[PDB]
Each structure stands twice: as C-alpha cells, then as structure tokens.
C-alpha cells in the first residue's frame, strides 16, 4: 500500500544522503549564492585552471581535464555501487546480474547527478569548491571540446523538472533496476523490484510536487534521453581511446566500457 512505498522512498533518501557527498540541495545553495561558504574558484581559462590547482586534486590541458573527469567518475561509480547495495532486494540478485545492472546504469546516473551540479554556464567540481565554465570546456581542442557539451544540453532540460534529492534518490534506483540491460540472466526479480520503485517514484512525485502534473511521465521519457547520451558518450570515448596515446583509461572504467554499445 501507500505506507510501504513512502517507507521505501525514505529508506532510499537516507541511503542517498549517506552515499553521495554533494547533494543537489548544497549544489544549488552553492550555485545561487545562498550558502554562507567561500564561493567556488572559477576556472574559465588556461590560466585560471593553473591558478586553481591549489583548490582541486590531480600532460597537455585537454588531457589533464579529461583525466580529472576520469578520477571523479571512478569515485562516482564507487558511490553509486554503495547506493545500489542499499536498494532492497538488489544484493539478493545473482551477482553477475548486479554487475550487469551497474555496468550499464552507472553512466546514466552519473549524467543524472551531474545535472544537479550544473547550470547553463558551468559545472561545480571538487565537491563544490571549483566551478568550471561551459565555454571553457567547449573551447578545448577536439575531441575534448565535444565531451561535456551534450551533458550540459541534457542537464538544462532535466533541471527544468525541478526535482529534489528525495525524488532523485528513487529515480536513480529505478534506472539501476532496468530489466532490459543486455546479458541479464534472471529478469523477473529485477522487474519485480523496479515495479515497486516505479510506484514509489509516482507516489513521491504526486506528494512532493502536487502542483506538477505528469512529472512522473516527463521523467520516464528522460530515461531514454539518458541512454542516448550514454551511447553517444561511449562512442566519443571509443574515438579518444584510438586517436590519443599519452593517456590510459582507469581500470574500473575499462571494466565498464568494454562490450558496452
């Protein structure tokens, strides 16, 4: 019934808060000014990047930025993995199915959650203490110029739905429990869990945004946009793996990308 679904929402929200250092709540405070904290160091060009090394943590520039984005994704994957293990029934699944779900879902969540840190002008980094501008990321030499821009385009549309952390906690869980990922061994228990999460998400969107009608339906349409940006992103990384040599992909990300789209 309704009560059980609310309890699911709340367990997931608590778990999200534990797993993810920087929430959409703080990110937005930081971005609108409303936090009393020291503003993030703005990185709008090659020099500001240089001066801002003291505020962030590890050859040419495009490559260095990409490898920084790389370090952070590994930590995202780790955080997302801990979050998944808190989704009731996830750890009882066939371990190979847990791996498949993460493998295909982690990037979809990375983009979803990256939108929390983004506006039309740029993205917060190093847990809110840098802000790297969109123009600066575009201005990178190709193929690194094209890397973040589809994430900004998506974020701009996604952020219009005005979801909060409590909504997002359930949405991310729904994404993880996708019964149609390639190579799953036992679909039914995954779909049983996702059916519950989807009900929990719908109730949540009615309660938390009663003025917003069909936010639930708008949100499901975006799960498909996410797969695109993930596919588009795998291909650009395919290009980068080939056309560049002075840079190794992190092992965890190798595990994730090989035999993926």
């Amino acid at each position: 019934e309704s009560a059980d679904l609310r309890a699911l929402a709340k367990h997931l929200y608590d778990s999200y808060i534990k797993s993810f250092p920087l929430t959409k709540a703080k990110a937005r405070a930081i971005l609108t000014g409303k936090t009393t904290d020291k503003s993030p160091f703005v990185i709008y060009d090659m020099n500001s990047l240089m001066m801002g090394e003291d505020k962030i943590k590890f050859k040419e520039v495009a490559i260095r930025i990409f490898q920084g984005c790389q370090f952070r994704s590994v930590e995202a994957v780790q955080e997302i993995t801990e979050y998944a293990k808190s989704i009731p029934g996830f750890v009882n699944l066939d371990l190979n199915d847990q791996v498949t779900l993460l493998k295909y879902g982690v990037h979809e969540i990375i983009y979803t959650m990256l939108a929390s840190l983004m506006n039309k002008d740029g993205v917060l980094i190093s847990e809110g203490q840098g802000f790297m501008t969109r123009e600066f990321l575009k201005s990178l030499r190709k193929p690194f110029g094209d890397f973040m821009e589809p994430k900004f385009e998506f974020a701009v549309k996604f952020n219009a739905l005005e979801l909060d952390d409590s909504d997002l906690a359930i949405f991310i869980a729904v994404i993880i429990l996708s019964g149609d990922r390639p190579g799953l061994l036992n679909v039914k228990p995954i779909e049983d869990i996702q059916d519950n999460l989807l009900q929990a998400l719908e109730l949540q969107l009615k309660l938390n945004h009663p003025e917003s009608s069909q936010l639930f339906a708008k949100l499901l349409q975006k799960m498909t946009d996410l797969r695109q940006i993930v596919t588009e992103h795998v291909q650009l990384l395919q290009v980068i793996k080939k056309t560049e040599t002075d840079m190794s992909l992190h092992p965890l990300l190798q595990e994730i990308y090989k035999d993926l789209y």
Binding site: V77, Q78, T81, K85, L95, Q98, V99, L102, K103, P251, L252, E255, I256
Partner: peptide
C-alpha cells in the same frame, strides 16, 4: 572479469 566491480560489490 569485472574483478573490481565484483570487489566493490562483495565489500
């Protein structure tokens, strides 16, 4: 295969 992913899960 997926040794790290496996490791992160089994933790």
């Amino acid at each position: 295969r997926h040794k790290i992913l496996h490791r992160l899960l089994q933790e």
